[PDB]
Every structure is written in structure tokens, then in C-alpha cells.
Curated annotation (Swiss-Prot), chain A:
Belongs to the universal ribosomal protein uL30 family. The lineage of its organism: Archaea, Methanobacteriati, Methanobacteriota, Thermococci, Thermococcales. GO terms for cellular component: cytosolic large ribosomal subunit. Part of the 50S ribosomal subunit. The keyword Transferase does not apply. SUPFAM superfamilies: Ribosomal protein L30p/L7e (SSF55129). InterPro entries: Ribo_uL30_ferredoxin-like_sf (IPR036919), Ribosomal_uL30 (IPR039699), Ribosomal_uL30_arc (IPR005997), Ribosomal_uL30_CS (IPR018038), Ribosomal_uL30_euk_arc (IPR035808), Ribosomal_uL30_ferredoxin-like (IPR016082). Keywords: Ribonucleoprotein, Ribosomal protein. PANTHER family: 60S RIBOSOMAL PROTEIN L7, LARGE RIBOSOMAL SUBUNIT PROTEIN UL30. The gene is rpl30. Signal peptide: none annotated. This is Large ribosomal subunit protein uL30. One of its GO terms (biological process) is translation.
Curated annotation (Swiss-Prot), chain B:
Belongs to the eukaryotic ribosomal protein eL21 family. Residues 1-24 are annotated as: Disordered. This is Large ribosomal subunit protein eL21. PROSITE patterns: RIBOSOMAL_L21E (PS01171). GO terms for biological process: translation. The keyword Ribonucleoprotein applies.
RNA sequence: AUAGGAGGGUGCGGCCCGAAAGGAAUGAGCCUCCCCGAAGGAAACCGCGGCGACGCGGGAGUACGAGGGGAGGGGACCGGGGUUGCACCGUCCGUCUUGAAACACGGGGCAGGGAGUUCGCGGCCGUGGCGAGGUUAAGGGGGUUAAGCCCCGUAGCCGCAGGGAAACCGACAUGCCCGCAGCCGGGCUUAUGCCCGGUGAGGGGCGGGGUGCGAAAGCGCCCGGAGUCACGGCCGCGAG
RNA sequence: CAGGAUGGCCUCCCCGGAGGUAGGCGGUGGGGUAGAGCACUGAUUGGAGGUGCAGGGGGCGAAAGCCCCCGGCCUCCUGUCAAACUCCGAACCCACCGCCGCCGUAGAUGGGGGGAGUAGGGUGGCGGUGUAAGCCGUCCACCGAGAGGGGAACAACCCAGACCGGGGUUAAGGCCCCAAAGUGCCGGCUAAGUGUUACUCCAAAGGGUGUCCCGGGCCUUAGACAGGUCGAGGUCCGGGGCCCCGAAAAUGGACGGGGCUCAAGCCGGCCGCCGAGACCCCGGCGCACGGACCGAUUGGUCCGUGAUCGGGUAGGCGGGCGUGCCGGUGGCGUAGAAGCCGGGCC
RNA sequence: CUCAGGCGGGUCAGGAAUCCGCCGUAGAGUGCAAGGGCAAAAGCCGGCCUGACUGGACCCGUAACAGAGGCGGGUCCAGCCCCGAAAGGGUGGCCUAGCGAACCCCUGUGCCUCCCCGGUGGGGGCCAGGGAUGACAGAAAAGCUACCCUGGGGAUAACAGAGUCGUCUCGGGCGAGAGCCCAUAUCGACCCCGAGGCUUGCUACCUCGCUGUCGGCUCUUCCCAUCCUGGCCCUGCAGCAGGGGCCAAGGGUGGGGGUGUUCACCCAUUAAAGGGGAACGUGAGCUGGGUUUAGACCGUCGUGAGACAGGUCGGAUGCUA
RNA sequence: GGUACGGCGGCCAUAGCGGGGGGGCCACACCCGGUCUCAUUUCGAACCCGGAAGUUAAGCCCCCCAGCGAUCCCGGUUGUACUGCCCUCCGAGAGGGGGCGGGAAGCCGGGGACGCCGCCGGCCA
């Protein structure tokens, strides 16, 4: 499957190993999201940095909306239906569906940045950033519920 | 009180042997052979006191880069420095 | 003359000034209307869920929205400046120190003076001249109001051959292998660019050579030509 | 030993050309810590059995000796230990190999050269030491050398790392008034102003038919207890939450203050709303890198990328502003130069 | 070839002389501390020998990472050799301690060299071994200062402040026991839990370009763990008085002798003659007796200059708010 | 190809210690005798030289066990003890707790285990 990972906590009071793990994941700043695979290496990295991020499974509709709104090309240019059709031959919905199914990967779209800089959620997070999501916090694995958060952050 | 490092400094357990392994080891480790570029672990045999590397390098894995007499030339990377040691095959083990 | 903070910061409101240098009668503040608008973003009302605070779907991504434009009315201000009021914030300056508002030291006010300078040697870099050569020193002649300017001056110093305490001996102007840039040929690529195969200066590595220790092997240093002079700068040592 | 040198950590320039490894997955090796245990070495309560054992003392006997105990030494059972013990043994750390990820031909790993500063550190977690404060190391997180929003102020705690002008949403946390946001919702508890304290500050052993509950029990609805008669539940035990006593200080006074009792306190939750220079957006500046074009001495205009540029002490490096004089070049001035006071613009 | 120890059996001979058999993973031993390693040995007993040698390389450690004079160790090439049938082993001690720059000097061994040339005596040089610096990365080296001087340090003591409460003061839990019986009228062992910062100590956080000390006098104020004065409870409380405890801080808690004294002791009164905080309150309020300079005497220590938290006599107190 | 035959080895106790039954074609032994080789710090005891009268009594070979020792699997104690990262979670303190990730030792019960395996040769076929 495909995992959406959003950084939650800031860049202060972070030890070198976790800082470098987040840098490798490209989560340099707060409210930044990336999409990765479910490989053991990525799972291990998520476990290593699980105290400063949240992650879950992303749906095709959510990925399509994310690409449509917050997706950007090199140069911070908007990603549009005309461009995606001219470069791949299908609409954003079909591209997202194929990516979620695993047929293709986001990198297949040329000049697409791998990180989506989200907006702070509407109504804020419903939990403190000092606790995990299982006990009412806003950290760690949260499963399919990450789609609602991604919708709120656009 | 500061103590300088010597060959046997703090080696009570590192250079000790299992009670059931007292005596001469099997001759395979003594008579084994290696090739240039092969990687070997450095596992010291306390009974044999000849061709023993410094215990500070016990447990590492090095690269064979030659041979002199009956000793193998093993290169290791301590930090960023390349250190060359002459280790008897009895103190060596092939990787995998 | 009922009001509290190192004497200031952000925003504006009173009173006052406002010719010139700033905008402005070729239109100021101002009043009205119209268009597009990024991120963001309501409610009236309708139906439903929840014990409840409330939420869900439509209304709606609508009114509004930083900003970007246009038209109409009026006809002299706006910017700026002095003081002061209100709201919030703010415990002076330099210095040693882990730590300064400090009950730690230097701090009445103003003006003027005030602290990486010169030489010798040496290591580097920026640039310029010449180049297996480079460069003059003291000094000499010409000319000049003049110490400016022109020419000469090879003594001397560094480099061209290193090794050794000394006696002393005394070397590749390329034998070979990897190989960056560049060049050549081919394929993909709109092109850029990428890939592949050769040649590859400079670079790295072998091989061989000189000398010192040795009986020899073997090791140290060195050998297939780049140095020298000048201007400026950083630094090390000695002179206060 | 208030001082220096060599290293480590910073900065500037240059050569080299195809790799590198802070994080992760799997594998090949090393370990002897926490824990545990007696299989070694050393400790350790009692009991049983076996051994005359230089034990030792008594009964017994001129004497040589036996019989009693106690002790010593072994096996077992029973009850306990170890920083200088280990038959066992993690988490975890380190070396190497393959791969994912990241960085690198806009030139990394690496090499050469120039210039330094630094040799009092502090808070915080862990380890040895100490009654404790503290001292001495270790971890590199924060202050030193760090803005903004909070904890009442607070170095160190929470959010957060910051070019300039604007708009919006969130973070720490907060919503009775001071003070923006609820006298917000449901269930329960507290009667002590206990509390109104995340941490920097916070009182104990011992006790309470004070209350609200859980779990075990014995009797047990005309039969159980209180005083053979009534006639509804009793009588214990071990626990959990809150509260109570134990609880005495010096200028008058500290939940920050006012004050607060189905709360404005505390528990298990929930719903809205406020709240940063953080996150998003619009316009602008500079910087690093690459490119095009253009300068008769270091350069200039513009363009492309920057989620992976914008805090800063010691220190390194580049550009720029100002003053006296000299060689040039172009000029102003008695229709008023320099200088001096107050204003406008860049 | 196999040890320490143990068991059974043996003339003197026993606990232990010297033997014989069995069990015996090392419980023995190693030249020496400890750790590790060593059982057809590295231990024990024997044979031969001197490799504890000469001319040289590369590497690890002291000194991780990350620089090093000197030193120690490891892997090798050559020479001449030792042991062994041979393989194979030998560059001291099974591995880790037992030691040391420059200059100068002594010794061995061969060579070079000494100012125009040559000889002789002598000198200098290269290589190897040795003489030591223990403050051990290498000056040759006794004290007083109270007559002291200078530059600094709160990086560092004495008083005071701050943290802590070991100690100090004051409470609590349990109840062995003493009390004719009776644990709690009163005392309360052995143990355990606390409060204050009023004794002393520990730390070194602020203060050494200056914050004047103990004691007394004057004066102001505060706490209760209350000595008296007001009101109560228990009593091994007959009364008069006592012992223990509770509420209570409005008032008082005085005068004298010796001593610089605080304190403590003592005297006569009194209801009582309470303990403490305030920069050990109060020296820009006083006094200056003690303490702590400069003069001097005695005792003790030192060869001496001198010293003594040992006595003793004398020894300054600035002010215009 | 057989063999209750031997030599040289590998892992070095799951393989050891202690017990029970079975065997002598060849082979391995016990053993007969010490002139020669060799030796006793005496001993032909060991070592060595020369052989077969006897024996399988035991070394050796084949098969079996679970008393001790060792060690593999499963179940219970137990996801207990302990531990990496984060925490505005509790606790006066000591110390504990929540989320994600690792995870024993000892003890008890039931099985396993009285070793696998390689090169060559002897005898027979």
C-alpha cells in the first residue's frame, strides 16, 4: 500500500539521529506531507521517527485532491489537468487511482515535487502533540483516519 | 587515578575462555587459508600467544590485503585512519 | 497639583506648526458606483443525528477577502514635524563571568586629542614581466630648476642534481598500466543532455636509475626541466 | 595548574574525478551490563545422616584404654547473598556485506595551503562518591552564542528556531473578572477554602463506623444484630478514590490577585471558541548555484532553482560609507566658498 | 611422566618419616602481585645447547577516534648457529610491570678528517654498548616577615548571607519494663517517622577597584515550642501544694558580686525574675573592656632570623544630608 | 556388493560418567620369551625386539537404558523480570506509569539424547 506521512512537531529539541531520519524522509518543516511505500525500510524509518510525525494509509480520492490542490511542479507551479493529460495521458483521478493501486509511482509525473506543504488543520488537531493518536494525541500511526486530517489540511 | 592502556588492560572476560573450551582448539582455524580481498572477523584465541593483535581490535571485521610469513595482513578503519595488522590465521574467521 | 516606572517601542486621538526643498487645481483628504480577485471563508432558512454542549447534507466555496483596475461628485489638503493622551509591551550603557537590572567593577554634562606602527628574516596567497634562465646591489654617464626621466653596471643571490658526518660518488629529455577534461566515431534524445568505443595533455601507479647503511637482499632521500623578480595583502620571530 | 605547544571542533582558496553513508531492513561476527542463579570463589539460619577427625572437655578405668557429649569436615533438606562471583543472559552498542532512503559531475568521500578562536563552562538524564547540598565523569538535548508565544516574574521547562510589508489558520496552552475566548455538556467525588501547582517550590511514619465504591467471607427477610420477645438485613476481613488528624516563627500578604462549593476544585470523557515572527498565500530585498548578454583592473543587466537559502558570541571571508594630502580629469564661487542652526528628499 | 587433597593397607613409624592400590578437570604448580592461558603441558624429572647473537625492513601500543621525541611489543629477509628422525621451534623469561632526552665522558670496532704539501705525537667525525636525571617528556638549590611592598583573585579561607540538617532544639508511632494489681497518673528501654533553621559543621553560590568585629549602653519591632498574669482537662488531685497536658502573645519578666565577657555560678527580693528573630537588629547613635598590626616581658619550640587558636602592659573610631 | 574388521580425520559431552546382553574367517587385542635393537635414575612394570600354546575374561566391535552430567523441542510461571525512544501521566519522596518496539534467567510437566559423518584399505564375494 501507500502511506502518507505528515510532520507534527517542530525543529527544536530534536536529536541528530531523528533529525537525520526526518531529513531523509524530506520532512524538513512542520505541516509537510510525503507519500511513500510500505516497504520494511520505510516502516523502520517511521518507527525511528514516530515521535515527531503521524502517518497512515491514503485513499485514491484523497491523493487526487492533494495533487489537484497542493501538488506543485519545480518552480512552485500549480499542477493542472491539461499538464497531467499532456504528460501521462490521463486525468488526476486516474493517476491517483493507479498510484494507489501500485501500477505506477508519483515520480512518473516529470517535474513533480515529492513533498506537499499542507495548511494547518481547520478546527486544529483534536489532540495534543505530546501524545500518540491511540490515547487521544496527534502522533504515530492512525490508519485510515489520516484521510480526514489530510482533507482538513488540504 | 588515571591508568594507561596496556595489552591486557581490562581483558578479564574478553580474553577468557569457556570452561568447556579449555585446551587446544581444533586445527581447522589454525590451518585455514584466505584470499586477497576476503573479509575476515578478528576473534582472538587466548591460548595462542603468537601473532595476536591488540585486544582493542577484537570483534571487528577487516580486509585481507596480503600475507607475510604465516601471518595475514588485515586492514581496518578505526575512525578515519587505516590500520594495518599482522594476524595469525588462528585469530581469524571468514565472513559468512 | 488622584498618580508608578531605565524615561523608550507599536498604533492611533487631542492642541499647535506647515512658502522652499515632498506629492498636489494636468486634482488632496474625502463621498458614491462598477469589474477581477490568492490563501481563507460565514449566516437566514430546509431535512436529519445526539440525553446535551453541538454536528452532518443543501444554501456554498456563495456574501466577504490582501491586492490589481475603471467611472462619477467636490474642490485644498495629504505626507512630514513639536508636545501630549490612551491600550499593550519594555528592569539603562561597557566589561570579567556558567550566570548582570544587580547590594560586582567603569559610568555630572559638552567640545577637542586617543590606541596593529617601522625595519630585518621566513611561510603563503592576488596579479604582472621574463623564462632554463631570473634579477640586480654599490656605483658610472646623459639630461634636468630639481633627488624626477634615459642608458649602462653580472660583483653578488636563487634555480638548473641529488645522496652523505666526511672522503667521495653521481640519475628516466618516457619502458609500461589506469585515467578526468578535451578530440574523434556510433546509438537514443526536438534540442540540451545521456550512453557506448578509441586517443588521452595535466593526474595517479608500476618498472628502471643515483647516492647513504650493508656481504647481499631491502629500505630512506632524490631523478622524465619551472624557476626567478616585482607590487600589494595575511601570518610567525626579534626589536618598546 | 589564572600561562603555553601538538591535536580535536570553525572559516577562506585551490587540486581530484565516481563515490559516500547520519537513518532503516536482512545477514555474517564481537560482547558479559540490567535481570537471574549457586555450576567455581567467598559469605549464610536451623535440621537430618556419615566420619575419631592433632578437634577438645567430661564419665570410665593405673592407665593402656573405651562410653558420652560439644566442636571440625563432607552429602541432603530448609532460609538468605556478592562492584572487585558466574552454569546462564537480554534490551542495546560496535565492525563488515547486500539493498531502500539521502547526498554528489551545479563536483561529495578524499588531498594541499592561509587565518584563527578555544585549555573556568552551566542546566537537564545516567553512573561512582557524599547525611544532604555538593564534587567527579558520562549523554549533546537547551543557555553560553537564541528572537517570538506561555509557565506571575524565571537561562535551563512547553511551543518555536527569525530577511522586509500585508492577509489567513494553527502550536504551547487557555476560555468567571483582571484578560481574547464557555459562568460549556454528560456521569461521579470532595466540605477540607483540601484545592484552585505539568516541572523549576510542594512534609512523613502512624491512625479515621468521615464519606463513595470493589472483592472475598460467616449468619442470612416472621430466622440474622441493637434492647427470649419483637421482625429486615446483619457481622467480619483484604483492598481502591477523595478528604480528615498527625502540622509551631519571627515587618503585614500571598492559589499571580479578586474570588470560587451540583464549582471558578478533583476524577473518566466530550463539544465549541480564542491564541505565535510557527504553517499557507500575495508583493519586495538579498544570498548560494547555473545560464545568456555586456564592461579596456576585482565587474555589470536580466533570466532559472532554492520543502531540502535568510538567528548568532569568539573567529574567517566579500562588498560598501566617511576624512587629510598628492598625479590626472571635469567643475563651482564676492549675483557669495568653507564653516555653523533649523527643515525636505534619497 | 602427571598434580593438590581423600579413602583402604603396611616393622620401628604416631597427625606428620618411606611405601602399595583406588578415586581424583586441576580443587596442585608457574621466580614473584593480580588477571588470563597452560594435563600424552607452558607443570615435574632428564639429554644437548647459548637465538639473552650480527646486518636490516614493515606494523600495532604508550598516545582509540586524532598530532609525538623516547620506550616496549608483533610479522618478516639475510648471515652464523642450537635442539630434533623429521615436520617443526629458537631475536630471552607463558602475555600484561621491574625504568629515562640534549651536552659531556668511558669502552668496542672499523673508516673519514685536522686550514700550502709530507711524516710523527695528539685532536675531531660516523656506528654500537654503558654512567641519570623517582618532580621519573629530564633547573644544580634552605627559612622568617607581626616593619613588610606591588599586581590580582570572591577562579580561593575567616564574620555575615544562601543550600543541607550530619549535629543542635522540639514533637510523633509501637510498648518491653518500673509503678502494692494497673503500659499509658508519671517515667518509658530496643527500634522507627518527622518539624524548626534558635548550636556546631559541611558546600563554595553573591560580596576582596574595601558592606568596619565580640561585648555593653540607647531605642524600635515581631514568633510561640508560655516563666508569671486569664480560663480549662487528667492525676498514684483530702486541703495547702505538686506531676502531665490544652486555649491564650493584652501586659511583665527587675536589682546586684567576681569575669571583656554572651553564657554559666552565686546573693537578697519577686507572681515570674521564658527561650528567640530583626545583616549573630542597632559604631554616617555612643563606649572601646575582649579580638587582630606596628613597642615590650615571661614560658615553650627553633643553631638562627623567629613562632605560638599561651599568658601579660600600652596602643586613633573621619561627616556641611 | 557385503563385513558385531582396521588406519587417517571432521564437528569436539545431544558425543561424557555409570550399567546390561552378544563376537572372534580375516583383522584388533590379552598373552609366551627377552640373545640380538632399545631401557629402567631397580623392575622386559612402561618402551623396545622375537611369536603364536591359550583366551574372547577385557580393550575393541554390535545392540539396549535416562541414575548423574550435558543439551534440543513444546506447554505453564509469562509477555513475568528487565529494557530502547517520546511524554504538560501519577507519586511528598523513593520511584512508578501510558504509547510503539525488544524480551529473559531459574523452576515445574511431557518428549529427545548412551553421538552423526568423510577418505582409504584388509577379508569374502
Amino acid at each position: 500500500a501507500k502511506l502518507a506521512v505528515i510532520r507534527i512537531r517542530g525543529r527544536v529539541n530534536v536529536k541528530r539521529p531523528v533529525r537525520d531520519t526526518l531529513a531523509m524522509l524530506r520532512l524538513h518543516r512542520v505541516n509537510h506531507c510525503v507519500i511513500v511505500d510500505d516497504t520494511p525500510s520505510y516502516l523502520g524509518m517511521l518507527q525511528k521517527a514516530k515521535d515527531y510525525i503521524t502517518w497512515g494509509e491514503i485513499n485514491a480520492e484523497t491523493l487526487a485532491k492533494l495533487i489537484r490542490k497542493r501538488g506543485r511542479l519545480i518552480g512552485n507551479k500549480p499542477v493542472t489537468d491539461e499538464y497531467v493529460k499532456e504528460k501521462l495521458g490521463m486525468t488526476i483521478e486516474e493517476f491517483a487511482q493507479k498510484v494507489v493501486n501500485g501500477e505506477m509511482s508519483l515520480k512518473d509525473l516529470p517535474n513533480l515535487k515529492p513533498v506537499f506543504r499542507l495548511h494547518p488543520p481547520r478546527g486544529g488537531f483534536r489532540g495534543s502533540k505530546k501524545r500518540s493518536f491511540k490515547e487521544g494525541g496527534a502522533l504515530g500511526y492512525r490508519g485510515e483516519k489520516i484521510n480526514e486530517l489530510i482533507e482538513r489540511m488540504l | 587515578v588515571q591508568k594507561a592502556h596496556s595489552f591486557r588492560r581490562k581483558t578479564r572476560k574478553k580474553l577468557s575462555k569457556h570452561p568447556r573450551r579449555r585446551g587446544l582448539p581444533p586445527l581447522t582455524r589454525f590451518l585455514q587459508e584466505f584470499e586477497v580481498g576476503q573479509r575476515v572477523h578478528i576473534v582472538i584465541e587466548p591460548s595462542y600467544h603468537k601473532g595476536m593483535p591488540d585486544p582493542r581490535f577484537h570483534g571487528r571485521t577487516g580486509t585481507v590485503v596480503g600475507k607475510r610469513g604465516e601471518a595475514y595482513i588485515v586492514e581496518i578503519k578505526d575512525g578515519s585512519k587505516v590500520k594495518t595488522l599482522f594476524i595469525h590465521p588462528v585469530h581469524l574467521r571468514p565472513q559468512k
